[PDB]
Amino acid sequence: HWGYGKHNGPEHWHKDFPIAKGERQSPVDIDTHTAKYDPSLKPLSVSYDQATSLRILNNGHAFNVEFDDSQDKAVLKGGPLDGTYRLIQFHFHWGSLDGQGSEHTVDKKKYAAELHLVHWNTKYGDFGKAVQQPDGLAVLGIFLKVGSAKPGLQKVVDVLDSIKTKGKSADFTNFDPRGLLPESLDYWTYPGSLTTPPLLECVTWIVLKEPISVSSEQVLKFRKLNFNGEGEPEELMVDNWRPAQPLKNRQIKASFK
Ligand SMILES: NS(=O)(=O)c1ccc(-c2cnc3ccccc3c2)cc1
Ligand SMILES: [Zn+2]
């Protein structure tokens, strides 16, 4: 099955998921000089004060911090969006080296990691229905650069030892995702896809221009996770990013001048 290795990595996915060669695939390079300022773009509305985190899971390609999405608790609105999107999970993509790891790039620059806060459009009733719709998901993407530690990330880092291998999960209640956001909510936005199989073309991408800083030790502990399950040969969970895909007939808009 699919993964990030030489024999099952992004270059192979199209054989099981032909949409990998589609017209609105993610991630993309964000050419900041070609992205046009759109003065009609509204500010983002990130309402996370009532977020209810539940669990953290090693799913064999990343770790997901999952939320209660059975009610409107943590929601994304505004920006390019119509309607209300419920937070269901966030996860990261990261590198084996500080100089790579993000999925989106900015003027071809790669960050050490990228955070994805995944939300689904409540008008479709549940997550599984939403991913079948071209406006089903809104993913808030946030770059991570290596520098000073991010205090609000440390509770995530601390628990990774307990979910080292594929299929392990741990209680993760009372985590506040507001501690993962940068100061500014200026963003770029474009229509795209899931960056992992099934690669469905259901995502409005909202990528924050301001990265967050994490410490070398924080990302180091990301890289001690495992792709494999317990009892199998150890494969470090590193370089779980898909590279930039052709922009094709899309325009990236900027919320800011
Ligand atoms: N990396 S990303 O674009 O933010 C992202 C990628 C994939 C999913 C996801 C994962 N597994 C699925 C299984 C069945 C249906 C939809 C799925 C979506 C959810 C979010
Ligand atoms: Zn992702």
Side-chain angles (χ1 to χ4, degrees), residues 89 91 93 103 116 118 127 131 139 193-198 205:
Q89 52 102 333
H91 60 270
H93 305 263
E103 301 211 299
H116 288 163
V118 180
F127 177 89
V131 295
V139 181
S193 71
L194 311 173
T195 69
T196 56
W205 275 99

Side-chain angles (χ1 to χ4, degrees), residues 204-222:
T204 299
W205 275 99
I206 302 167
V207 180
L208 295 192
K209 79 152 188 240
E210 183 180 338
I212 58 161
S213 286
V214 302
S215 65
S216 53
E217 293 86 7
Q218 283 178 325
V219 189
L220 175 59
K221 299 197 183 181
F222 281 20

Side-chain angles (χ1 to χ4, degrees), residues 22-70:
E23 298 306 299
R24 56 175 281 187
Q25 285 292 290
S26 302
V28 299
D29 180 55
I30 297 170
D31 175 14
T32 64
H33 295 113
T34 297
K36 189 195 176 63
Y37 169 60
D38 185 344
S40 71
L41 280 176
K42 307 190 190 69
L44 274 181
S45 173
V46 183
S47 298
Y48 285 173
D49 49 279
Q50 292 293 105
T52 297
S53 63
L54 298 177
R55 192 179 71 147
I56 187 168
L57 167 73
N58 178 340
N59 63 16
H61 47 98
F63 59 85
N64 288 359
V65 172
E66 308 166 341
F67 290 78
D68 176 23
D69 70 343
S70 70

Side-chain angles (χ1 to χ4, degrees), residues 126-137:
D126 68 67
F127 177 89
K129 178 87 67 184
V131 295
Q132 296 305 338
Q133 318 303 327
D135 60 346
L137 300 199

